[PDB]
Amino acid sequence: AQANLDVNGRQVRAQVEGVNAREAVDRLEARLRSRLERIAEHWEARRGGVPAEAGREWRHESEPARRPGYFPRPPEERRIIRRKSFSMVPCTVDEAALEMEMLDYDFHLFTEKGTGFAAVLYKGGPTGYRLVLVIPVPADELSPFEKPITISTHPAPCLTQRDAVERLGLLGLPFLFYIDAAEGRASVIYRRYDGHYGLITP
Amino acid sequence: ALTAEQKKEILGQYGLHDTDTGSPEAQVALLTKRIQDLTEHLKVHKHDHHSRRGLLLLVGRRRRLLKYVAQVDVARYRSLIERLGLRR
Amino acid sequence: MRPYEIMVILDPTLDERTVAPSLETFLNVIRKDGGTVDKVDIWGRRRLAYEIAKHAEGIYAVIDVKAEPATVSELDRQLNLNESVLRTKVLRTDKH
Amino acid sequence: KNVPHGAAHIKSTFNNTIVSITDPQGNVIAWASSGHVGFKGSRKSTPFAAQLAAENAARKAQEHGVKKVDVFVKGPGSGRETAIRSLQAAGLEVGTISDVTPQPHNGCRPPKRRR
Amino acid sequence: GSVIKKRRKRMSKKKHRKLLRRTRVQRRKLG
Amino acid sequence: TRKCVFCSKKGQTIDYKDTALLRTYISERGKIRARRVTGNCVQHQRDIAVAVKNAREVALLPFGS
RNA sequence: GGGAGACUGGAAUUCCUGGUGUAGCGGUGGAAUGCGCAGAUAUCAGGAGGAACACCGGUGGCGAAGGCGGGUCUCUGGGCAGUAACUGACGCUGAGGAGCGAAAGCGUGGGGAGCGAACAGGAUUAGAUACCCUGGUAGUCCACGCCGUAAACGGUGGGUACUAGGUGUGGGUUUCCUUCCUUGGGAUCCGUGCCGUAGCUAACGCAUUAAGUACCCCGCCUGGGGAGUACGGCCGCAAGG
């Protein structure tokens, strides 16, 4: 006995042998019932194979773990083992952008020509570039430029080292530019390529 | 357990001589004193089963020591039993 | 007679100049119980880590006593009964 | 009223985010929820819904005289990152960030595990 | 060892327990 | 590794009164630091934990500030 | 963190009260029952109550086993090391027997925040007496008592002597590097893991903590179902053992 069914495009076929028509038909019915049971594909039959939980258990379609670019190096012995002080000679926006480009660094901390204040430039994404100052000033006071940039309206706040690390952790930005509470001057912390924080100071 | 002074006085009163501390008479006396103290404790804390097991161990050791004494010298066994107020 | 260390925190409203005499009277019972020895040190008016009984500051007193356990328990009961004592804590300066 | 300085309370659960701006004496002055910005069901658990709710709450605090705020995050991470980013992006200055999540000292029995 | 033996034993014990539940009152009235 | 500063010949005694000696042993969140990150022996770690808990009970250290 | 009793601390959940405050909150793979518009959720302040003790915290400690960590006090058991003062074989095992014995369950009296068998709806399904969601009674808790079962497992009864080592870790004594700070290293006794000889095993594997080499005592097995069931008996308030 052979049976073929077209369940909504899915072909389910079965074949049995028997000593007579009745036994063969009954065995074929049992076989087809088992096949259809294994075919269901509705939610009740596909709910135990869907990946569950967050970290426990792993499956082929389980969501891959989100990994940051930096080595983890958890808060335990994170430390600050990179302190650059590249340049604080005054520069203009275009000169700061060129100093950015060959350094291959997404953000860069310099001191502005017109203001005399510390500033940090970074890639503003599709909007162009973005400039952040210790005290926000308009474009007219800022030295003339030709690159299309925008200025962040918020000021760099005053806060401590541990508070800065906490803000960076809870705010998830690639860096934090701030005026140090104890030092009173500019500082840019970024998570390094080894898991430590890179604190750039004057 | 007992303090040093109680042990000293018990050993002095029941010890065969002024030095012995492991003689079966002295051991039996010390075990009996410990047993009575543990009984007085357990009369208050009925549900302290672990100390009750310790009491059972002490009782068994005292019984074995009395067995040894009665096997070695009957008169010493009678004297010890009558002096410490034990029944069996 | 065992040694004990009692740390008490009192409310800050009452004057500090009366803390040492008043506490003295609180020890009088344990002084008359069994011939006990006391050493009182006071370093008070310190802000607490957390608010205790609607209070932020407190007066800290340390008493080193050598007395019987029953006497120390009775003294602790009296100290807790007093309304001018925010908290008490009794430790044994022995091996324990 | 006019409250130049206030606080921001962000509760980001696994299926909703609630943002409330608060006069520092603890009085809510303007709140926006994930479902209040047009989302419903699982859609309101997304970070984008948290962004919209945070921006709406920021505007509803800004027209009330709030200029500088400090944020108190709370709850398992669903859209906290985007919530604070949107709070900043709507012209509301962020003073400080504090993680105040109710952490029991092993009290109460949690519900039985799902399967 | 394989859990097949345990399955057989648990099935037997379960059936006996169900029988006891079914005839508890009758056993009490005859006992 | 690190040194059990108490097993040394200059090891200060562990008490629940001297608050600085305990503050140096708890993290910035107020939690008790692990033994490995500290390196003290098991007995001294237990004494430190007991002293920290006692000081918390007498309102000398915050309960997770 | 061995056990019992007493007192007591904080975070958090729930509820109540009073402010600010609006239209959603909650829940899922997706939703709906449900809560709210009579003012919910959110936020602050105050109050009440119950249970469990984050960090320390581990293949780490204690206990015969079950098992045991918020803090302090009182009472109490056991173990280890050194000296070897003391007694002088007083040792081992143990049929029956007695005691302890997780959780669930039963009785009397309290307590009841969270969780939650049973029970209601919601959802999925061809059907859902289920898995998922919203509620939720016994129970989980305390006191005094019962029961006497567990994958009560290391699936390995107790005691002793011997048989290559290497390396973690807990406790205690001591010699030499010697700063004598230092897991310095060595020696030794008592635990607790990993790897590995000989040897044993059907194999997997065990391997000084033997499943190796031997001695003493106890318990248990004699093909699978029927069956740890029937009858009889003992115990139990009952479930049942």
Author numbering:
A (entry chain w): 54 to 255
B (entry chain p): 2 to 89
C (entry chain g): 1 to 96
D (entry chain l): 23 to 137
E (entry chain v): 2 to 32
F (entry chain s): 17 to 81
Which sentences from the paper describe this structure?
A similar approach of multi-body refinement was applied to improve the quality of cryo- EM maps for classes 2 and 4 separately. Some of the flexible regions, such as RafH CTD, E-site tRNA, L1 stalk, L7/L12 stalk, bS1, uS2, and H54a, having a lower resolution, were interpreted by applying a low pass filter of 3.5 Å resolution to the final maps. The uS11 and OB2 domain of the bS1 sandwich the RafH CTD. The RafH CTD, which binds to unique binding site at PBC of the 30S subunit, also engages the bS1 r-protein. Therefore, the bS1 protein would not be available to facilitate the translation initiation in RafH bound form. Besides this, OB1 of bS1 also interacts with the uS2 r-protein. The RafH CTD, which is longer than HPFlong CTD, binds at the PBC and is sandwiched between bS1 and uS11 r-proteins. Interestingly, we found that bS1 r-protein was present in a small fraction (23%) of the total particles, suggesting its involvement in RafH mediated ribosome hibernation and further stabilizing the RafH CTD binding. As the 3′ end of 16S rRNA is blocked by the RafH CTD and bS1 r-protein, it further suggests that in hibernating ribosomes, the 3′ end would not be accessible to 3′ to 5′ exonucleases, RNase PH/RNase R.
Ribosome hibernation is a key survival strategy bacteria adopt under environmental stress, where a protein, hibernation promotion factor (HPF), transitorily inactivates the ribosome. Mycobacterium tuberculosis encounters hypoxia (low oxygen) as a major stress in the host macrophages, and upregulates the expression of RafH protein, which is crucial for its survival. The RafH, a dual domain HPF, an orthologue of bacterial long HPF (HPFlong), hibernates ribosome in 70S monosome form, whereas in other bacteria, the HPFlong induces 70S ribosome dimerization and hibernates its ribosome in 100S disome form.
